[PDB]
Amino acid sequence: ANLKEIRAKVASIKSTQKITRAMQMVAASKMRRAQERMAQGRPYADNMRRVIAHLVQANPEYKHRYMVDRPVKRVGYIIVSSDRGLAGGLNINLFKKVVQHVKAQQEQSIEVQFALIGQKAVSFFKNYGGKVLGATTQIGDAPSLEQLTGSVQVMLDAFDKGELDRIYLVSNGFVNAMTQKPKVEQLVPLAPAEEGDDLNRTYGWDYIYEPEAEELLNGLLVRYIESMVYQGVIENVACEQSARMVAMKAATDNAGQLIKDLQLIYNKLRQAAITQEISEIVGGAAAV
């Protein structure tokens, strides 16, 4: 029954099994790289949080529009995804979470608008419908902050007109080296970020503001939000790498099982062919 075809198929499967092991090897290394890249963005955000907190606490005259909770009529979503598949069920779970959240927001009679990052999200929510405001594609592994200013700028501009009231960030969280969890967190209505700091330990000195404090506060807030978005994208990149590693290991195991099944089938067919050949030879010999 053309046993050489089965032998070739088994060889090709065993070759693909080697192919996937190396892809797992590489995905682990990039997960390490993105994991240590997540750490380098911490001091910038820490310093900005400290400065903003001190400025807002020392000058409580006015409240900025990003720090006050106004009634909600429309919300927004910044959805980050990967550009290519073969990474577990990362995007599917994230999209299920955001869809459920949107359905929950629908009963409140508040409609939604989107800003998509990554090819998978673009396709999924172009087929889903909805009210898209911007799209971005081919982010890469180490995005430059310039590539991300478009979506956040569009969302913030829509917020400044009163069109939007909340803007949620939808991404994945890096729990450990093997597990990822979806997340839906608001960012524009800045939740007080440890504002209890520097009230008991605050000193009796203020800065010397070269511009008026209002403009300085606005400039600080915009950059702080952009940095939050960037370091939320980097963590999603790391989660994608971990998911791809896990998926490649699972594929290697499944190929290893396929080999063990095809070997049994091949052996059975080989014995059957030998028996048939011998039977025919003996019959032809006895008939002469």
Binding site: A1, I6, K9, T16, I19, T20, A22, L86
Partner: peptide
Amino acid sequence: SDLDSAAALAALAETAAQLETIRKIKNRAQ
């Protein structure tokens, strides 16, 4: 992306392509 398609998506479909042709002749004595 030059390696994602070439390594993963190409081979992993080739392996799954023609398995059914083998499993159906499993019990044949011909």
